[PDB]
Every structure is written in structure tokens, then in C-alpha cells.
Design a protein around this ligand. Sequence first.
Ligand SMILES: *[C@@H]1O[C@H](CO)[C@@H](O[C@@H]2O[C@H](CO)[C@@H](O[C@@H]3O[C@H](CO)[C@@H](O)[C@H](O[C@H]4O[C@H](CO)[C@@H](O)[C@H](O)[C@@H]4O)[C@@H]3O)[C@H](O)[C@H]2NC(C)=O)[C@H](O)[C@H]1NC(C)=O
Ligand SMILES: *[C@@H]1O[C@H](CO)[C@@H](O[C@@H]2O[C@H](CO)[C@@H](O)[C@H](O)[C@H]2NC(C)=O)[C@H](O)[C@H]1NC(C)=O
Ligand SMILES: *[C@@H]1O[C@H](CO)[C@@H](O[C@@H]2O[C@H](CO)[C@@H](O)[C@H](O)[C@H]2NC(C)=O)[C@H](O)[C@H]1NC(C)=O
Ligand SMILES: *[C@@H]1O[C@H](CO)[C@@H](O)[C@H](O)[C@H]1NC(C)=O
Ligand SMILES: *[C@@H]1O[C@H](CO)[C@@H](O)[C@H](O)[C@H]1NC(C)=O
Ligand SMILES: *[C@@H]1O[C@H](CO)[C@@H](O)[C@H](O)[C@H]1NC(C)=O
Ligand SMILES: CN1C[C@@H](O)[C@@H](O)[C@H]1CO
Ligand SMILES: CN1C[C@@H](O)[C@@H](O)[C@H]1CO
Lengths: 390, 393
Amino acid sequence: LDNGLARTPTMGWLHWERFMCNLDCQEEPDSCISEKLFMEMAELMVSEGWKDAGYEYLCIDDCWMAPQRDSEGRLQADPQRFPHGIRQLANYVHSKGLKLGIYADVGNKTCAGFPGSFGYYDIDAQTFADWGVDLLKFDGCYCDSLENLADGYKHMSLALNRTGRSIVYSCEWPLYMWPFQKPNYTEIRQYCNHWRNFADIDDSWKSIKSILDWTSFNQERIVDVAGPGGWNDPDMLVIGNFGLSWNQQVTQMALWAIMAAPLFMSNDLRHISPQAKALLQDKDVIAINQDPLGKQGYQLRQGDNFEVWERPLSGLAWAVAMINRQEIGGPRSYTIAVASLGKGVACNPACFITQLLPVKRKLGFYEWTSRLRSHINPTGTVLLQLENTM
Amino acid sequence: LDNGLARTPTMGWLHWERFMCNLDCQEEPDSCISEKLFMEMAELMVSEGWKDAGYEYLCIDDCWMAPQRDSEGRLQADPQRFPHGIRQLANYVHSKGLKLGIYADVGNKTCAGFPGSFGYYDIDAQTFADWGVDLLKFDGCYCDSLENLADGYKHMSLALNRTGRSIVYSCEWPLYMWPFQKPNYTEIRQYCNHWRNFADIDDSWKSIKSILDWTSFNQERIVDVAGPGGWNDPDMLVIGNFGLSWNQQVTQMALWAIMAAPLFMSNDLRHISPQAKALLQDKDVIAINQDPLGKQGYQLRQGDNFEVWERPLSGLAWAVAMINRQEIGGPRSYTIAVASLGKGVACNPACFITQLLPVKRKLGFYEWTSRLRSHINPTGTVLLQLENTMQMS
Ligand SMILES: *[C@@H]1O[C@H](CO)[C@@H](O[C@@H]2O[C@H](CO)[C@@H](O[C@@H]3O[C@H](CO)[C@@H](O)[C@H](O[C@H]4O[C@H](CO)[C@@H](O)[C@H](O)[C@@H]4O)[C@@H]3O)[C@H](O)[C@H]2NC(C)=O)[C@H](O)[C@H]1NC(C)=O
Ligand SMILES: *[C@@H]1O[C@H](CO)[C@@H](O[C@@H]2O[C@H](CO)[C@@H](O)[C@H](O)[C@H]2NC(C)=O)[C@H](O)[C@H]1NC(C)=O
Ligand SMILES: *[C@@H]1O[C@H](CO)[C@@H](O[C@@H]2O[C@H](CO)[C@@H](O)[C@H](O)[C@H]2NC(C)=O)[C@H](O)[C@H]1NC(C)=O
Ligand SMILES: *[C@@H]1O[C@H](CO)[C@@H](O)[C@H](O)[C@H]1NC(C)=O
Ligand SMILES: *[C@@H]1O[C@H](CO)[C@@H](O)[C@H](O)[C@H]1NC(C)=O
Ligand SMILES: *[C@@H]1O[C@H](CO)[C@@H](O)[C@H](O)[C@H]1NC(C)=O
Ligand SMILES: CN1C[C@@H](O)[C@@H](O)[C@H]1CO
Ligand SMILES: CN1C[C@@H](O)[C@@H](O)[C@H]1CO
């Protein structure tokens, strides 16, 4: 989408995976989907260094709406859980130097059952723009036809453009198309800043594995379309929650960097370990994810329960990730000729290699004839940056 | 097995899950199956407080043998990887105050392909006894018939008895029967100190879940068989490795305590986080696992992606574990009437409840009519101890 936005993958925070559709503010005031929760997240995004690291978009997902539209047919936030309204919340978020994302649905209802936007694309777009919304995630539930799906996504894209406000447009179009026909990614990229390809992530290593396996299986179809203004979205970062071991969190961070993925944290910023915070705020890994060249990486090799992925970077640099998919035993040795990396260009005549994950370590100079040997933890990933000696 | 051993579930360390059958001591010296590895593991078991916590048996698994037997027809340790032999390794292990476990197979070969014990049961038992072995894990690979499997397990049990040396006998008999017929657990318990029921564990939450689900599915068949001298073995503790989140590690520790399981760590004691160490050395949870009553716990309730397990303890106490099996979202609230716990005995007339996991916190006095409210993390477990009491506050 050539709206001048998302020139690097969007970074921010999205409530869905961690907080879902919790409406019980009587019994659970501190985790229900409310204006107070988003105020607290915004405060911590500023105070705990998230904004400094690049996490900029504070995004509302499903279950913010009142059960019905107002008298004039516009969407409204729930009166009790969002007493001051979305425009006021956006004002507060902007006063912190942050941007506000919101959620809507192309069909007749949101996935959780709140008002859909079908029939209201222009009024809903203008409402969001009036509110000061900076991002829209557009879900695909309750849509009866592929025609309605495509027409709705394109229509909302154009309506957002017509409002004249810069609004990042996040689509689930491909995901809801795939069961029936193959998405045309050129068209999607024409209309969307990023797009969900695969099933919702949850707080599990199984989820990570299946997202990675789907991405690598379909990479011939999705890798080359990505670039500044339009990214593949493998869904939220779940680092800092409950289901991932340290090495699985490392794997998610490293490979979301390799895949030039939007980095939407979905966790509790009020209760997050120092270790998870340091991983999510890792300057070198984020810099890889945010590389201005914007070329999505890919799986280079697969075998012996090992995976090698790589991503071309600005200025003749490359990122290389090595995953150990064997879920038994200990750190396993993997070796590869450096001439086999970066299409044979990365280390010709030589490269300096710096390991970034799980720990940062200068590995030294590697000649074009050299072999890179590493030990990779079960379900963990080793992430490396290669700098050609020029 | 009435040999006076394993009156509580055996505690120790077993190399299999973390180190497997790594024979490449040239290119992978730090993880190959060698005598140096076991010497160092013993040193850290003493120095790092594992022995104090109760972990006593340093156990060799598969891939310690030379490719074939000696001239005298006995097993021998691998000349390259165990140059000083099992007798000297056992002497060293005993000098640290520990006991040595070893591995063998009922069939013609070990699962990794080394000499089996069929045809040599008495010589192998006497070999181990001469070496100073204190525990034997007896695998079931390369056995063609239930005839041979059963006869071999019974035979090796009696052969070990014949030596006059106290040797804990760990069997995989039930697990290897399943392809043919359901185990007779009274008979197995007659011959074994503990027995593997289910497929090998690996370093994954999927593995923990499948072991737990199998155990709770089959609990009417196996729970009552367990007791002092004979335990169900749900396989090794994998806390301290790579595949489990903190909450999943808590779940494994809590429920291995609930199940009166043998506690065989399989990790690298040289590279283990302080948090995993504190969990594995948790005095109160180990005390639950080691409760002298020796009655195995069970799944009390299941539903809405929640599980409630409980274990009766000596002196009218109970352990209660609450698992959140929903793998999305945040901590979920669960409430239960205390009268539904401990068969209605735990909190009659009252109980004092102490949470032990994920953190230790006294919750207070709960009267028989009261309700317990808790919040449980996704894939985590809340472990509680209920102490029956006649006091009210
Ligand atoms: C070879 O097999 C035989 C049996 O097939 C086995 O003999 C058994 O040994 C056990 C353990 O020593 C005996 O049980 C003990 O019996 C005495 C006398 O009746 C009791 O005082 C003992 O009580 C103590 O230990 C108990 C735990 O076992 C505690 O519950 C108790 O509080 C006491 O501390 C204990 O019950 C058993 O009587 C014999 N059985 C027979 C038939 O002789 C022998 O040990 C085996 N040998 C080897 C090397 O495995
Ligand atoms: C509406 O769409 C137009 C055209 O697709 C966008 O115009 C582009 O804006 C970028 C940066 O602002 C320029 O580099 C391109 O050259 C522009 N293209 C054209 C054809 O003018 C415009 O940004 C969109 N407006 C909104 C509010 O989304
Ligand atoms: C996928 O969609 C794109 C855009 O809708 C199609 O590309 C257009 O093709 C027409 C020819 O019919 C050209 O006039 C346009 O210039 C193209 N646009 C772009 C941006 O390339 C493309 O044909 C579609 N692919 C398939 C297989 O249907
Ligand atoms: C919404 O519902 C109406 C009537 O039930 C139907 O005609 C229309 O196609 C629906 N829209 C979508 C996007 O499913
Ligand atoms: C071991 O191999 C011999 C030789 O073929 C065979 O006769 C015997 O039955 C085997 N034993 C077992 C337990 O499989
Ligand atoms: C199981 O084996 C034991 C030992 O022979 C015997 O006492 C018991 O009756 C057997 N049970 C069945 C069901 O055969
Ligand atoms: C099912 N949708 C897609 C998922 O990403 C959330 O946005 C949820 C909201 O209902
Ligand atoms: C497959 N066996 C059973 C498992 O517990 C190990 O002992 C392994 C040795 O080869």
C-alpha cells in the first residue's frame, strides 16, 4: 500500500492474544478490555523503554465496541469500559508520543459478535479518521462470499485513503481467502500495509512451529511480494507470556526479524520478566527486523531436524538464523560453508560474523573458504549477522 | 518388589533424555557417554546440593557397554569411553555418598544395539553385584514374545535377589506389553520396584501433556497398584533443559509429586538455571512426592480446559494440583468448594492451606463450608497442601 506508511514493519502492542475478549470488569477490573488497560499500557510503553526501542502503535483488538451503533449509525466504544470514548483515548495516546490502532470487521459482525462494517465502510473509515485513529486491523469473519471479502477490503482501503488521514491498514484478506482460492498477493499488497496469512497464534511452541512451517512451505509465493509498505504478518509476538521456553522465545524473536514481520507484542507490560523485556528490546535484532532495505528473508536449508534461514540486509550485510527442531537431547552441532550463505556473496572474499542470539558474541573473520560451526539448543535459534569485508 | 528398597519413590539422575547415545567423544566430548561425564555429574550432585535434596542414584542409561562380551562371557564397559571400568566408577560414586545405577536389556540387544542380557541373566546380575551396582534399569527391546519378555523380567528379578546385594529394579515390562496385551500390574509389582508405563518422554510440553493424559485416562488401572516398594514410572524429569516454559516445568514437578513418581532428573547439572535448581530442590514438593503413606494421587476433575488432581498424604493431609490447559490468554480463575477436596476429609472441620507452587504462600484457614479461589497460568499448575485441623483461625 503506497500510503507512505509502514516503510519498515510496524512495531507496537496488540491486546488480543494476552487479554482476548475479557468483558468481566466486575470480577477482573485489571485485565478486562477497558480504557484503563490501554492507558496503563501506554504509560509503560513510555516509561519502560518500549517506545524508545521502536514499539509505537498501541492497538485495540476486538471487543471494544458497544453492542450496537449509535443513533446516526456510527460505531461507538462500550460506554462502561470506554467511558471517555476512542477519540479521547487517542488524544491521550498521542500526548505520550504514541499511535492508536483499532479493530473492525469486513463482514456483518466481528469475530466476537459485535457490529461489523459491511454496509458502513465509508462512515466507519471517516469515524476512525475523526477519532484520530492511526491504524486499523480489519478482520474477515461473517463474510458470505469471496466477492464480498475482496470488495470490502478494497473498499475500506480506498475509504481510508479518502479520509486524508494517514492510517496503517492491516488486513486478514489472504487468511480468509486461502481455504477457497489462492490469494493474488500483488493485489493484496496494492491495498494493504500488511496481511495475515495463517491461523491465529496462541501461547505455544506448536503455534510457532506451524507458523514457520507454513511460511517456509509457501515462501515462493509470499517472500518476494513483501517490501516497504507491504509485509507478511505471521501474527503477534507472544514473548513474555507463559507457553514458550526461553529458547522458543528466542526462536520467535529471531525469525520474526528474519521474516521482516510486523512486531506486535501481545503480553502484559505490567508483569514481564527482565529477560523477556531485554529480548523484545534487543537493539541489534530489531535493527535487523527494521532494515530499511525491507527484503524478507527465507528458508535456505532444511534437514536433520535443522533449519537455516537467511535475510539480505542493507549494505552487503546478511542475517542468518539456524533452528534446532529436534526436541530431545542437548545443544546440537551444525556446520555450513559460509560460501553457501547469502547467495555466495555475503562472505566473498570474507565476512565478519557476529552472533546476536541467544547471546551476543563476536565470532571473528570468516574467509570465503571457511565453515561456520555452531551449537544450537533444542527448539532454540542461533542468529548471526554477516558483514562483508567490502 | 519386596526387597526392602524404594519405600518412597527413588530419586536420582539418569543420562538418557539429555545425553542419549552420543558416542562421538572426539567431536562432542562434553556430551558423549563417558566415565568422565558421570564423575563430574557425581561431583556436582554433591557440591550443588542435589544429594542433600534427596537425589541419590546416579544412573547410567544405554550405551555404556563394549560392542560385545569378554572371553569369560561377561559384559564389559566400553574400553575407550570407560577405561577404568564400572567397579572403579562405582567406588568413586560411593565415596561421594551416592549410589550407582546401570542399564541392561531383557532381549538379545539393548535398544541402541549393544549386548542384551537374554541367556546371561544370572551372570549379568552377578556382574552388576560384583561391580557394586545399586540400581538396574532393564529395557525391553529386541524381545520377540510375551513369553520371553515376562520370563526375562521375572528371571532377572530373581537373579538380582540371588546375589544378596540390595539393587533397585526398574522395569519397562508394562510399556513393552501394550503391543500384545494389557499388563497384569499385581504380577509386575511382585517383581519390580517401579515400571515404565508410557512412551519415552522428550523435552516438550506435548510430551508432558500426553503422559498426564495417558495416566489420567488409565488411572483406574494403575493408581491403586502403586505403593511402598512398587511405583508407576511416568519417565524422567526434564526440568532444566530447553523445551519447557517455567510454568510447564512447574506443572511437571507438581504432578510428578502428585503421582508418587520416581524423580529421575535428566539434565546437565553443570549448566542449569538457578530457578530450575530451586524448583527441582523444592523441599516441600519433594516432601509431597516422598510422603511415607505412599499412596499415588489421581485426577479428581476435568473440564473447561481445567484439571484438578489430588493426592492423599499421611496424617489427614492432601496435595491438590490445578492445571490450566488453555494455551492462550492469561491467568484463569478457578474456584472449588473445599468439601469437594480430599474426599471431604481434608477440611473437616477445617484445613490450613499452603500454596507451594508457583510460589509458596500461606493462604490461611478454610472451614469445611468455605470455597477456595485460585488463578492458574496457561500451561501452569497451582500446587496446594491442605492440613486437616480442628482450629478455625
Ligand atoms: C530376596 O527376596 C526376599 C523375598 O522374596 C526378600 O526378603 C524380604 O525382605 C524384606 C526386607 O528386608 C522383608 O521385609 C521385612 O521383614 C521384617 C521381618 O518381618 C520386618 O521387620 C521389616 O520391617 C521393616 O522394613 C519395612 C520396609 O520393608 C518397614 O515397613 C518396617 O517399618 C520396618 O522398618 C520388613 O517388613 C521380608 O520379610 C522378606 N521376605 C521374605 C519372604 O523373607 C529379600 O530381601 C530379597 N533379597 C534381595 C537381596 O533382594
Ligand atoms: C492515497 O493514495 C495515494 C496514491 O496511492 C497516496 O499517494 C502517494 O503518497 C506517497 C507518500 O505520501 C508518495 O510517495 C507517492 O508518490 C504517492 N502516490 C501518488 C500516486 O500520488 C497517498 O499517500 C494516499 N493518502 C492517504 C491519506 O492514504
Ligand atoms: C493480480 O492482481 C494484479 C493487480 O490487480 C494484476 O496486475 C495487473 O494486471 C493488468 C493486466 O490485466 C495490468 O494492466 C496492471 O498494470 C497490473 N497491475 C499490477 C500492479 O501489476 C495481476 O494480473 C493479477 N494476477 C493474476 C494472476 O490474476
Ligand atoms: C450481511 O447480511 C445480509 C442479509 O443477511 C446479506 O445479504 C449480506 O450478503 C451479508 N454480508 C456479508 C458480507 O456477509
Ligand atoms: C536371541 O537370538 C537367538 C538366535 O536367533 C534366538 O534363538 C532367541 O530366541 C533370541 N532371543 C530372544 C529373547 O529374542
Ligand atoms: C496376576 O498375576 C498374579 C501373580 O501370579 C496373580 O496372583 C493374579 O491373580 C494375576 N491376575 C490375573 C488377572 O491374572
Ligand atoms: C479471530 N480474530 C482474529 C484474531 O487475530 C483476533 O483479531 C480475533 C478477534 O476476534
Ligand atoms: C529406548 N530406551 C528406553 C529409554 O528410556 C532409554 O532407556 C532408551 C535406551 O535405548
